[PDB]
Design a protein around this ligand. Structure first.
Ligand SMILES: Nc1ncnc2c1ncn2[C@@H]1O[C@H](COP(=O)(O)OP(=O)(O)NP(=O)(O)O)[C@@H](O)[C@H]1O
Ligand SMILES: Nc1ncnc2c1ncn2[C@@H]1O[C@H](COP(=O)(O)OP(=O)(O)NP(=O)(O)O)[C@@H](O)[C@H]1O
Ligand SMILES: Nc1ncnc2c1ncn2[C@@H]1O[C@H](COP(=O)(O)OP(=O)(O)NP(=O)(O)O)[C@@H](O)[C@H]1O
Ligand SMILES: Nc1ncnc2c1ncn2[C@@H]1O[C@H](COP(=O)(O)OP(=O)(O)NP(=O)(O)O)[C@@H](O)[C@H]1O
Ligand SMILES: [Cl-]
Lengths: 417, 417, 414, 413
């Protein structure tokens, strides 16, 4: 009782805890009436979709294969999605004519400015958050905030005087002299705030530095009227691919983090639509900045129909980015998890997964109760590629399934220009 | 099951890490194509770009192994870069078409970071290599100011046709605040470094930093060698980064820069499925907090990057990269070699024992037991030239003897300038 | 039994193994001339892998280090001895041997300038003179200090006046401006001027130097060179001594010397026949040394053999920091445990654990247990220690005997 | 038998406990020894120091009192951090010394009285200016010491070793004046040149203003703790104070305690010397700067320290956890008196310090004394574990009576 399924010694009777079942057994169990999507070949419980999925695993284990499969099936079902797509891979395979591209250096990119998303006044601070993500440390954040003040008041004015120019915004916030800026600032809320003491000056200095760090890309970005918000609202909008070339990843980190974040806040204003189904594919959560909206999005987007799919390698990554406490909370927001198997050199993360997978209490022969890990950390480290454990959200058993490499023809060039 | 497992033989293996005899393993791993060897064991082709981490105390044979690894890899005709202390590898394997980087060696190439700038984004990219990551939060803040100063200055110098390192150095650490300030007019850094005491303070920080790093970069012989181009040239040969131990502390920042340079550069190389590149970082913990190693270890699969690094105690790398980042770092090496350490370092021994893994077994008193395949004590009592080899993925581990193959000197290790 | 403290067993499976003193003595015995640790002959190959002698006060750390030294001398090995109250000196002092003690008639004249030979040597030793800062912040000032130091000293050297008095004057006495002036032309010229931060940096540096330099200044002058000494074969031995009521005063000086050797040995012409010992009676009593680390890692070629003493884990920890202290201890492959106090269970555990556990089969039931319990360590009688040489060797509990040595020289003079 | 847990068939290894009497016999030696709760202390365990830990009212007094008495009967000399002149009123003789700025019988003292060589200046600024609790605190502390030592040095130089003047310059004189006064001294430059320099000075001021007070208001004299130590017929020293002034005197007392700690290190080697340092409550003093080495190098001097502790958290907070551990580790002999059930952490620490044993009944490794056993201890009942390879024992402390041969306090004139 517990073979081909459980890795440990077969037992006599299951008492309580996590239940592990064979791949097949699971594939039936989860199969439902409606059209569903697949995770490693397993039919995903329709109700698990807006509970978000977290795919953890080492490098080269198949995260791609999986999210790719996941994306395809969701398409065959006609779902819309946003894909943090590195090197436009997803694009070249699934990209369609009516779909959108965000890549400041790609011939096909859309013209965009965060201005293109302001619709109410509260929207100013709202997006200053997407542009200027959260500071890694308290101190860093403090500066970050000053930056958002400067940003929002400046852009607010430029807009008012009919010149919503990123170049202009950049100039003022990082080039104009202190005094000139100060002058420009007269009339806006920031007028006083940034003057009166050394502290005040210091604060302004910090704001400048941050903006000079984030804005660069936002400026050199091709101009247009494209609105991520509007796009979301348009049914026939199509899909969105945020692509970039790997050797520039660090340079775009802030921009992309903005976009991704934009979406995370934007979806929250979308009009009540029970039929909407949107996917957010963030290949590597840890490689983006400490997003400001992600949190709530993973918590209040069920109504909008948001389905997030993110991947990770070591737990230490997201921790260092979001902070220990904040990282915990964030992960905890993904109700469904996939374990792809990691390296032996990282025993701590293998333990985390082993434990996330859970224990079970069993009655075994010689009678004796035993409480034990369903999957040992060892088992996870020793996993061969394209093999993973799938534990869907809620009350469902878990199973070890093989990942198959379906082939997809390239229906578009990954990059242009 | 004796002769391979140190504990009590057992009746049946249930799950977890499995250990096997040296030979047994050597057969299992043996493949059709030409492979390389780790302590005599043929390394599975697929595990090569998953990187190898060799951990072990001093005098245990880290050299002998890396030496073997390198040799075998050359016989197959692979290219490589070697952080080579005291030109050891050089004097044994160096050929005439090979490259040498050592500011104090008659044979070195002429180089400056300028030689690697090809696009605008390349400025910050390399300022990162030049100015490695700071050890503390504060530290890095300073480091960032340094890079700003560095990149804007160097950019201008280049612009006005005088890409001089001596010039750059002058400006950044010699020129008076004002003069420098003047020179920066017109560059992005013009305003950012002026306006409040904070602004001034920031500049002072950058000066200090650059004054610390640049030194060696200047006194470096001039030439036009480009690590980038080198990487792109097939008949390019190999690269040896050598130095005499008494000067290790002095070159740490330059070497770290080169190493890093490689780490970032291979990310821009044109698609070549036939490429095989090795990076030998004799002792990862001795370099600075490299800014690109991470992604290198994660996205260099299709560039064909294969990294081999050595470590002694876990506290070493921890102290350099920080506990969270170090975890992530080590976790990026899929294959591991445990050489055995000191009884004065139980912590590290524990970590290695644990990384090796536990197993669940069934023994005759039946008896289920979960236990460490390799005891911490076993590692501390290992005799030299003896080590556990646990190749990436799903494979058993084995305790193998390392043998001292002799290599004739086919070149002088150092040639005073 | 008689060898293992716990219950005798049926069969040894894996892990650490303990044996009888004599049995071990047999095992470690080699052909060539060897030295001894508590009477046990040390494996020639274990020598450059250093030895850490841990134990409580009065347990016999001296008796041991004393014995080790003697045997090594009988073999003709050279050595440096961080020797407190010149005890080691009075016993083994030779006429051709060197003494470093600013308050001893027989000391040699020394200035750190005496070790500069190339340009990279300036920072190299600023490191030895100005050890590492206990805290991150502390160290930051320390860096400033070394900048000020190296640039100043470098210039003084240039203008042909390598005076420690001048140097001290400039770096802690001259007015800010004057100094600033003197600095014109040197790399430090700009770095210490331009903003309040820049001046703060300077200030910090000043305080540092004013704390370290003192003893260096009041030190008898001469041309002696630790480096040179190291290169000279007929050189003899080096005793770094001092009177205990002045230890704190000299701590930075001594720490400087110790370190200087630590970096120095790294430049010596390779000589497979060289055998040098570094006796740092109490590692934790010095400053956070800047070279010690690499010394314990790259000195096999030079033939460096370090022997240090320690009491509580917390000590070294407090000085080098937890992470650094781990690394540091880990660098000594051979260990001796002398047994400590009941009042320190934490260190006792550390020792117990370092000694290791073993897996055994007994009357079948098999068990995993510590070869030596912390309690065993705590109840150890004096002149009794566990010897666990580096590598794959069993450990043994041996008695340390008090051999007597006649005083062939005065410990202190004048 | 005397073992709290279940009787066993055979002892294998670890801590061994025995009956009071049995121990009393084993420990008994030829020469004259002293007694810890009735048990004669192994002479060789004396310079290894004794740590007596116990909750309030468990008998700490009765013990140190006993210890002290038998020591005097042997003719040993000693120093006693004696709160409210308790020990004094009982053992004080005519030839013994007293240090209490508010007692008619106190001696006249200034730290100047201990300066004999140049290194002696910093040496004692350390005693006067204990170590700072935090890293930042100690930073200030060092500035203070610089100011202190440079100033006092000069006043001494110019022939006016006045504590009143010293106090004036360091906390009263204006910045400039002070600045002026310092010209010529090493501190001349150090404290000027930038805001950082001025900030350092401001800090040094404050520190001094915190420590010096009592040192000033202290009755002047020529007494020298150093000289006292060197003088054989010197007698005994009693550092006493009234409990309601303990916080105010904390710095001065710590100073004295510390002074001794450094000073004994200079004494000429005298194989016959036997000195005791009684610090009733170690955690009550400041972060002593010399205590450490004293507990490690005072064997030659014949120093014997005895300190008392309550909660491990006290000492930790004062000396820092790392440092606290080291310090505690320095006493080889320990006495556990039993504490509150409201402090299980320390109970554990003590239980653990007492140790485990491996016994045969099956083999079992267990604590010789449970944390609970320690919390449920009745008063005047303690465990004794002398330094070295010795068993421990649960022994009863009896209240011997001592006649008052001198008034505890004498606020006079
Ligand atoms: N076209 C293909 N042919 C064969 N095997 C493939 C192919 N694509 C992927 N694989 C296998 O799946 C693995 C990679 O899975 P994947 O999900 O791409 O990993 P990743 O960590 O996300 N990225 P990468 O390291 O670039 O492979 C490879 O190591 C192969 O074993
Ligand atoms: N040519 C050789 N002859 C004999 N033994 C050798 C030789 N090369 C290596 N060894 C052995 O292997 C050990 C050194 O291995 P190695 O990998 O160089 O150690 P390491 O820690 O990397 N450096 P090191 O401390 O300098 O030896 C020596 O202590 C010898 O026992
Ligand atoms: N000349 C000697 N004659 C007799 N016994 C000695 C002698 N030297 C040391 N001992 C014994 O060894 C013990 C001290 O050993 P030792 O190695 O000096 O300890 P330590 O901690 O290094 N320093 P110390 O406390 O000063 O003795 C003493 O308690 C004596 O029992
Ligand atoms: N003359 C006495 N008669 C009876 N019992 C006494 C006498 N003196 C002390 N005791 C007992 O012993 C206890 C105090 O012991 P002691 O060692 O003074 O405690 P302490 O914690 O050091 N100081 P304290 O709290 O002041 O008692 C008292 O609570 C009594 O139970
Ligand atoms: Cl006077």
């Amino acid at each position: 009782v517990g073979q081909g399924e459980f890795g440990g010694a077969p037992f006599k009777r299951f008492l309580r805890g996590t239940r592990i079942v064979s791949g097949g057994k699971l594939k039936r169990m989860t199969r439902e009436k409606a059209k569903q999507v697949t995770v490693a070949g397993v039919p995903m419980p329709r109700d698990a979709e807006p509970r978000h999925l977290l795919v953890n695993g080492a490098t080269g284990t198949g995260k791609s294969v999986l999210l790719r499969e996941l994306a395809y099936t969701g398409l065959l079902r006609g779902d819309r999605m946003v894909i943090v797509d590195p090197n436009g891979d997803m694009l070249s395979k699934f990209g369609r004519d009516k779909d959108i591209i965000l890549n400041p250096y790609d011939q096909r990119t859309k013209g965009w400015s965060f201005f293109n998303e302001i619709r109410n006044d509260y929207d100013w601070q709202r997006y200053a958050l997407s542009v200027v993500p959260r500071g890694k440390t308290d101190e860093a954040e403090e500066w970050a905030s000053y930056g958002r003040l400067l940003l929002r008041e400046t852009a607010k004015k430029l807009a008012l005087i009919g010149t919503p120019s990123m170049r202009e915004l950049f100039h003022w916030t990082t080039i104009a002299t202190f005094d000139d800026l100060r002058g420009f600032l007269e009339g806006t809320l920031a007028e006083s705030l940034f003057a009166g003491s050394n502290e005040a000056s210091k604060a302004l200095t910090s704001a400048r530095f941050v903006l000079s760090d984030k804005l660069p890309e936002h400026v050199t970005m091709p101009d247009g009227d494209f609105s991520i918000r509007s796009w979301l609202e348009d049914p026939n909008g199509g899909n969105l691919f945020i692509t970039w070339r790997e050797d520039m990843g660090p340079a775009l980190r802030p921009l992309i983090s903005a976009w991704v974040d934009v979406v995370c806040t934007s979806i929250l204003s979308l009009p009540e639509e029970p039929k909407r189904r949107l996917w957010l594919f963030i290949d590597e959560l840890a490689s983006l900045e400490k997003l400001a909206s992600l949190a709530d999005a993973l918590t209040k987007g069920r109504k909008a129909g948001l389905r997030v799919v993110a991947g990770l390698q070591s737990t230490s990554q997201l921790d260092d980015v979001y902070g220990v406490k904040e990282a915990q909370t964030l992960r905890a927001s993904f109700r469904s998890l996939v374990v792809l198997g990691g390296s032996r050199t990282d025993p701590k993360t293998n333990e985390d997964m082993s434990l996330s997978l859970g224990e079970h209490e069993v009655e075994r022969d010689r009678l004796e109760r035993v409480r034990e890990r369903v999957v040992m950390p060892a088992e996870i480290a020793n996993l061969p590629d394209l093999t993973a454990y799938v534990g869907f959200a809620g009350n469902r058993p878990i199973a070890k399934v093989p990942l198959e490499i379906k082939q997809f023809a390239n229906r578009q060039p990954a990059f242009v220009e």
